[PDB]
């Protein structure tokens, strides 16, 4: 869940 | 410890140099990506476990965004300035059915931020305090988040009294806008959930993700 | 000016020495009469125009009452102590459908008030700050209310740092519970309005009056 | 309106 958020935070 | 207001001020300067409701929702989505980049610039935030970073942002995004466009609209007449470079006048909001909540933002936030001349440093610190919400459910280590919050308002108070020695109550006055921010945040979310329900009002992917459960 | 914490402390000591939901509503009604007598003991409150006294109380009663039974329940195990001398255990609340909100009160208020050992003086001052809500709509003179609020937290801060010199962040920590209080207040009201709607759950006259419009 | 409240405050 929270796909967009995890991705942005990861970079 | 290790929470200089200079770093917090830099985070603010780095991220920010016909239906009014639709314009607001599009601006919120756009600003959500920026919020993440801003949070990353907040000392020690990125050092927290990815999961807690998600919890803190999902729990404070609306208040964080409301605080930003409100302070950004201090010079605006009777309305606010969206990140998209667009202006939403109080009458336009009223003619869209969101007049009640809009006025609360102008009266409780915008106007009050203008009366005390809240600066960018103070704004940033307040948003940093909101980000570090120790009450956010799910936190793997709430004590740690509470520690960061205490360092932020510890540095903020130092900033005040020093920059504004003549105003000994400025510090408390700043924190005393958090209750209104929380209330306005909650109401704005209720509207967003209604817009999503009615189907009307275009809602982008990142904003839609924030309206997910829990 | 003229806002001694001793008077505020006295106001607290003067007013306070099977369905759990029904018990809570009956306690709230009983405590509403006491809230008025307490407010009258708060310096300068009675000197405000009758109309503004009504606005301030109608706008802060729920938060004012939540703050009181929460601090009163610091010694309680996993639950709260009602003014009626009755105890509502966390499991009992959960078995009544109000478990979510009940836990927020224990986690965000009760537990936190216990961890920092918030005293009666501090409690009273926080309630005095809530009473003097300058954002309350309808106020004939919001500036005046704002003045009283600044004197209360000005005296509270003096109290702290002096009584707890070792804890320089105590003052801010105390004010930082107001956001949670506002949120919990709003949720509790939503429940009350639902109970009134469903018809079940006995609601007394004074409590019913507070659920009136606006 | 607010009958009970006004009365209590008045006394
Ligand atoms: C939740 C929210 C986000 C706003 C983000 C913006 C506008 C960011 C920006 O432009 O800087 C605010 C809303 C969204 C719900 C409707 C509303 C009405 C009046 C004022 C604000 C709002
Ligand atoms: C609005 C309110 C008033 C409580 C007054 C009391 C209990 C005063 C007292 O006994 O001191 C609290 C409610 C009322 C709505 C239901 C609820 C559930 C859990 C915890 C609190 C509440």
Topology record:
The complex is a heterotetramer, with two copies of chain A (11 residues) and two copies of chain B (214 residues).
Chain A: H1 3-10
Chain B: H1 5-15, H2 20-41, H3 50-72, E1 79-81, E2 87-89, H4 90-94, H5 99-115, H6 120-131, H7 142-159, H8 170-175, H9 178-198, H10 205-210
Antiparallel strand pairs in B: 1-2
Helix pairs in contact in B: 1-2, 1-6, 2-3, 3-5, 3-6, 3-9, 5-9, 6-7
The complex binds ligand 1O8 (2 copies).
Residues 24, 27-28, 31, 62, 65-66, 68-69, 82-83, 93, 98, 101-102, 105, 188, 191-192 of chain B line the site of one ligand 1O8.
What does this structure look like?
- It is classed as transcription.
- The entry lists the keywords ligand binding domain, cancer, 9-cis-UAB30, transcription.
- The complex is a heterotetramer, with two copies of chain A (11 residues) and two copies of chain B (214 residues).
- Chain A has 11 residues and is mostly helical.
- Chain A contains one helix and no strands.
- Chain B has 214 residues and is an all-alpha fold.
- Chain B has a single domain (1-214), classed as Retinoid X Receptor (Orthogonal Bundle), CATH 1.10.565.10.
- Chain B is built from ten helices and two strands; from the N terminus they run H-H-H-E-E-H-H-H-H-H-H-H.
- Chain B has a two-stranded antiparallel ribbon with strand order 1-2.
- Chains B and C meet through helix 7, helix 8 and helix 9 of B and helix 7, helix 8 and helix 9 of C.
- The complex binds the ligand CC(=C/C=C/C(C)=C/C(=O)O)/C=C1\CCCc2ccccc21 (2 copies).
- One copy of the ligand CC(=C/C=C/C(C)=C/C(=O)O)/C=C1\CCCc2ccccc21 is lined by residues 24, 27-28, 31, 62, 65-66, 68-69, 82-83, 93, 98, 101-102, 105, 188, 191-192 of chain B.
- One ligand 1O8 is lined by residues 24, 27-28, 31, 62, 65-66, 68-69, 82-83, 93, 98, 101-102, 105, 188, 191-192 of chain C.
């Amino acid at each position: 869940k929270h796909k967009i958020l995890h991705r942005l935070l990861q970079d | 410890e290790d929470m200089p207001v200079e770093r917090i001020l830099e985070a603010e300067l780095a991220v920010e140099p016909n239906d009014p409701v639709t314009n607001i929702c599009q601006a919120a989505d756009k600003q959500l990506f920026t919020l993440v980049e801003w949070a990353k610039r907040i000392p020690h935030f990125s050092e927290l476990p990815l999961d807690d970073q998600v919890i803190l942002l999902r729990a404070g995004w609306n208040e964080l965004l409301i605080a930003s466009f409100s302070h950004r609209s201090i010079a605006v007449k009777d309305g606010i300035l969206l990140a998209t470079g667009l202006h939403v006048h109080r009458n336009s909001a009223h003619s869209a059915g969101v007049g009640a909540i809009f006025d609360r933002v102008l009266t409780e936030l915008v106007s009050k931020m203008r009366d005390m001349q809240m600066d960018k440093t103070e704004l940033g610190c307040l948003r940093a305090i909101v980000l570090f919400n120790p009450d956010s459910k799910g936190l793997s280590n709430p004590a740690e988040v509470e520690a960061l919050r205490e360092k932020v308002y510890a540095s903020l108070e130092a900033y005040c009294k020093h920059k504004y020695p003549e105003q000994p109550g400025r510090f408390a006055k700043l924190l005393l806008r958090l209750p209104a921010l929380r209330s306005i945040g909650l109401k704005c979310l209720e509207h967003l959930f209604f817009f999503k329900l009615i189907g009307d009002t275009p809602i982008d992917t990142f904003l839609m993700e924030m309206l997910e459960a829990p």
